[PDB]
Every structure is written in C-alpha cells, then in structure tokens.
Amino acid sequence: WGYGKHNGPEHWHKDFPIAKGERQSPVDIDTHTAKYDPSLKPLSVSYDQATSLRILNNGHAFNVEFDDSQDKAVLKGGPLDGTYRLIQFHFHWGSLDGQGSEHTVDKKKYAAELHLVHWNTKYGDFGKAVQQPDGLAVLGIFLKVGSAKPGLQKVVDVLDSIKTKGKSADFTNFDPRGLLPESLDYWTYPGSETTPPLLECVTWIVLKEPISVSSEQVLKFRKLNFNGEGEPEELMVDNWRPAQPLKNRQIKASF
Ligand SMILES: [Hg+2]
Ligand SMILES: [Zn+2]
Secondary structure, eight states: OOSSTTTSTTTGGGTOGGGGSSSOSOOEEOTTTSEEOTTOOOEEEEOTTOOEEEEEEOSSSEEEEEOOSSSSSEEEETTOOSOEEEEEEEEEEOSSTTOOOSSEETTBOOSEEEEEEEEEGGGSSHHHHTTSTTSEEEEEEEEEESSOOGGGHHHHHHGGGGOSBTOEEEOOSOOGGGGOOSOOOEEEEEEOOSSTTOOSOEEEEEESSOEEEOHHHHHHHTTOBSSBTTSOOOBOOOOOOOOOOOTTOOOEEOO
16 A cells, blocks of 8 residues: 555455445535534643654655653643653655645645554553554644745654665653644544545544744655665655545534
C-alpha cells in the first residue's frame, strides 16, 4: 500500500476490506450540521512530563515517538472516559499548499494535518488498545501556511537525517506543547486510523483552530522520500487519505 496510482487509497480495500467499513476516517466536517453538545467537557492535555525518544521515516510519513511506559504525556476530559497516553505524532501533507489535510472543514483542505496518537491505558498496551472500539484517541490539528511556528523548527532541522525509509535519529527533549493552537475548542466523532490496518478504534478530536507554519517549514517536509536509501527517488508528498462517507455518524462540537 502507498499513495500512488497503483497502490493508492482507492486500492486499499483489497488488502483491508475494512476500508469500506461503517466508521471510516477522515471525513468532511460540515460546521452547520455539527451538533453543539453542551455535555462536552473541556480537553485536558497534560504534556509537561513528555519524553521524546526518536523520529523515524516509516516510508509513509515521519513519526516522533514518546516513552509510554508511564502516564507521562496524557490526554483526558472532552468526550473521553479514562486516560489516554501519547505514543507518537506524525503529519499528512500535500505537494502544494492547497491540499494535505485528511479532514476537511466545509470542504476546505489545509496544507497539512498533525495527529497526536494516544491509547487507552485500561487496555495496558497499544496492541490491545487496537482491539477496542474506544482503544484510541487522535488529536488532529490543521496547519495553514503563514508565519513560522517556533516549536516546529526542531523537527524541521532533523529531517535531513531521516530522508529515506528506514532511517531513524535519537530525538529527545522535544516538547509537543509547542505545537498546540491557543484554543482547545474541537469537533469529535467515532472513526478509524487513516492508514492500514484502518482499524475502527478511534475517538477523533479535531481542533477548530489551525496552527500556522511558514512556507519554508512545509517545504522541508516535501523533501522526504517514500523510498529506501539507494532506490529511485519518490518524494514523500500527498500522503493523505480522501474523506469517507459519514454514514449516519453525528459530529458533535464543543462550541
Ligand atoms: Hg477497534
Ligand atoms: Zn495520521
């Protein structure tokens, strides 16, 4: 699987029949059809004790991994029940500034999308987590091209070191708090992972407010390779999945 013509998202269903399941992701957020739910609690992001370990090119994106052996960086509150621990974050981005996000807002596409992946601790590990309807929680943040994001530069500068698939680099003392918008207002809906196995275990929390990144910051993302070292160079761009049918689901807003 990939994002090319021959192995793109239109082909995933063949190896993962769940692709055309009942709660697939991403979706279009219709802000006028979204339901204001007053029962929604504010999000609680506790990332003060976060421990970053490394960054690696997995051939479809770059992942920044965190030590999740203890409740170091957790997510609670909102539509969740219990504590969810950060495991890794990654982005989805396009070839041009006009496309790149997975989720859309009233059909608008952003330049990139950031996913902070978290797993429900009653399940003891990530691996058991993906066997449950409420096993994961993904915080999604849109990126729009504007002013540079200070907090992102440490990531940008290390990309040279993990250019091709399989490469990794030690990546400690990175504070994810540098990537959050000012407001935590969000939309939520029951969905799935956006890449194979496309498991339907995710509670999606998509922030209304986008963060801005400079043209030069997004450029560096586009210089990454899908391919492995010593193989024909294929730029790592447009690693996003198109929006899926909502199919009855209801998107609720915290605002
Ligand atoms: Hg699941
Ligand atoms: Zn993602």
